[PDB]
Design an enzyme around this catalytic site. Structure first.
Site, PDB file in Angstrom:
ATOM      1  N   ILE A  51       0.810  -1.220   0.000  1.00 53.82           N
ATOM      2  CA  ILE A  51       0.000   0.000   0.000  1.00 53.82           C
ATOM      3  C   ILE A  51       0.848   1.276   0.000  1.00 53.82           C
ATOM      4  CG2 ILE A  51      -2.136  -0.955   0.984  1.00 53.82           C
ATOM      5  CD1 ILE A  51      -1.307   0.258   3.638  1.00 53.82           C
TER       6      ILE A  51
ATOM      7  N   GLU B 163       5.308   3.201   0.469  1.00 53.35           N
ATOM      8  CA  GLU B 163       6.741   3.152   0.769  1.00 53.35           C
ATOM      9  C   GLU B 163       7.203   4.406   1.489  1.00 53.35           C
ATOM     10  OE1 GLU B 163       9.367   2.334  -2.417  1.00 53.35           O
ATOM     11  OE2 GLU B 163       8.157   3.329  -4.034  1.00 53.35           O
TER      12      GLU B 163
ATOM     13  N   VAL C  88       5.094  -0.695   3.025  1.00 50.10           N
ATOM     14  CA  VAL C  88       3.983  -1.099   3.888  1.00 50.10           C
ATOM     15  C   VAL C  88       2.982  -1.963   3.096  1.00 50.10           C
ATOM     16  CG1 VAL C  88       2.267  -0.220   5.532  1.00 50.10           C
ATOM     17  CG2 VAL C  88       4.358   1.102   5.123  1.00 50.10           C
TER      18      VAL C  88
ATOM     19  N   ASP D 261      10.623  13.511  12.504  1.00 47.02           N
ATOM     20  CA  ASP D 261      10.195  13.522  11.105  1.00 47.02           C
ATOM     21  C   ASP D 261       8.688  13.768  11.033  1.00 47.02           C
ATOM     22  OD1 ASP D 261      10.764  13.457   8.294  1.00 47.02           O
ATOM     23  OD2 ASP D 261      10.291  11.285   8.188  1.00 47.02           O
TER      24      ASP D 261
HETATM   25  C1  LIG Z   1       0.011   5.748   1.971  1.00 45.74           C
HETATM   26  N1  LIG Z   1      -0.412   4.784   2.972  1.00 45.74           N
HETATM   27  C2  LIG Z   1       0.385   4.451   3.990  1.00 45.74           C
HETATM   28  O1  LIG Z   1       1.591   4.728   3.975  1.00 45.74           O
HETATM   29  C3  LIG Z   1      -0.242   3.813   5.198  1.00 45.74           C
HETATM   30  C4  LIG Z   1      -1.613   3.652   5.366  1.00 45.74           C
HETATM   31  C5  LIG Z   1      -2.137   3.065   6.486  1.00 45.74           C
HETATM   32  C6  LIG Z   1      -1.263   2.584   7.463  1.00 45.74           C
HETATM   33  N2  LIG Z   1      -1.578   1.947   8.667  1.00 45.74           N
HETATM   34  C7  LIG Z   1      -0.469   1.629   9.361  1.00 45.74           C
HETATM   35  S1  LIG Z   1       0.926   2.065   8.567  1.00 45.74           S
HETATM   36  C8  LIG Z   1       0.102   2.722   7.284  1.00 45.74           C
HETATM   37  C9  LIG Z   1       0.617   3.347   6.175  1.00 45.74           C
END
Ligand SMILES: CNC(=O)c1ccc2ncsc2c1
Length: 292
Positions: A28, A30, A36, A141
């Protein structure tokens, strides 16, 4: 020795392999530490996210320890819940909550946030930051990319990979850490610094939410830092578009002298936050509701 680090990590992580209870990994996103995926718990059908960081592709791989320090010790309602951590092959894997309303970056890029919505984001980041800062933990960050939303519109902080800890024994940090555009000038000047550096970056995120991008986003990273260091606090592209009460707020954040900057705790009583809406006020901005 990559192998020596893999061994160091095994001493701090949960034993085993999550691929034993998870199904259907889908990428989903990076970051700069890794990617991720989402997966499905096989027995229950719940979703989780799994952060995958290769141990061989880090700027400083010792920061990977930050994931487990935070998972062990600094869990809180305005922070992502991180469930377990594993060494898998040559990668560290953190299984965590899936924040299904996604990242705030997607909102700012395609939407115009109003002040009720801006104020709710700011309140919830500042709830988190006061609590962390009181324990001497600096995130380092802060940015739209670091802020995640749940389906029902609740704001949690993420991406603790670069955080560090201060205290009486170690009162200030010295490292050059973060994403250039959001870096506080004391940090760029290589002054030793504290949690004041998160307050500056939050300001920059305010400007993200108002202008759509941070100051000097068109210059290469190196030049823009020179710019932050030298020139005065950056101005909203769109000054005319903000209430005086929010200008009053941003003014307490984008102070160049760290000593005269506001603290997370003081900023909680600032009047701009009385406008904060509930979580539900953020839900319309998400991609799955935006056009519908
Ligand atoms: C662009 N999306 C993401 O980077 C994203 C989305 C949901 C999420 N829930 C735990 S980590 C995490 C990352």
């Amino acid at each position: 020795s990559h192998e020596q680090f893999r061994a160091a990590l095994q001493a701090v992580v949960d034993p085993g392999d999550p691929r034993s209870y998870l199904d259907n990994f889908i990428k989903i996103g990076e970051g700069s530490t890794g990617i991720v995926c989402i997966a499905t718990v096989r027995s229950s059908g719940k979703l989780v996210a799994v952060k995958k960081m290769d141990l061989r592709k880090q700027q400083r791989r010792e920061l990977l320890f930050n994931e487990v320090v935070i998972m062990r010790d600094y869990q809180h309602e305005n922070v992502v819940e991180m469930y377990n951590s594993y060494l898998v092959g040559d990668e560290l894997w953190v299984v965590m909550e899936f924040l299904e309303g996604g990242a705030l970056t997607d909102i700012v890029t395609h939407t115009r946030m109003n002040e009720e919505q801006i104020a709710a984001v700011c309140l919830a980041v500042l709830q988190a930051l006061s609590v962390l800062h009181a324990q001497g933990v600096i995130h380092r960050d802060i940015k739209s990319d670091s802020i995640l939303l749940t389906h029902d519109g609740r704001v949690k902080l993420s991406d603790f990979g670069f955080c560090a800890q201060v205290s009486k024994e170690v009162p200030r940090r010295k490292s050059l850490v973060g994403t250039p555009y959001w870096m506080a000038p004391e940090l760029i000047s290589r002054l030793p610094y504290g949690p004041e550096v998160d307050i500056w970056s939050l300001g920059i995120m305010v400007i993200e939410m108002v202008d759509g991008e941070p100051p000097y986003f068109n210059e290469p990273p190196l030049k823009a830092m020179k710019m932050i260091r030298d020139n005065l606090p950056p101005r909203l592209k769109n000054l005319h578009k903000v209430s005086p009460s929010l200008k009053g707020f941003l003014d307490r954040l984008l102070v160049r002298d760290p000593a005269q900057r506001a603290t997370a705790a003081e900023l909680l009583k600032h009047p701009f936050l009385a406008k904060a809406g509930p979580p539900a006020s953020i839900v319309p901005l998400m991609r799955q509701n935006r056009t519908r």
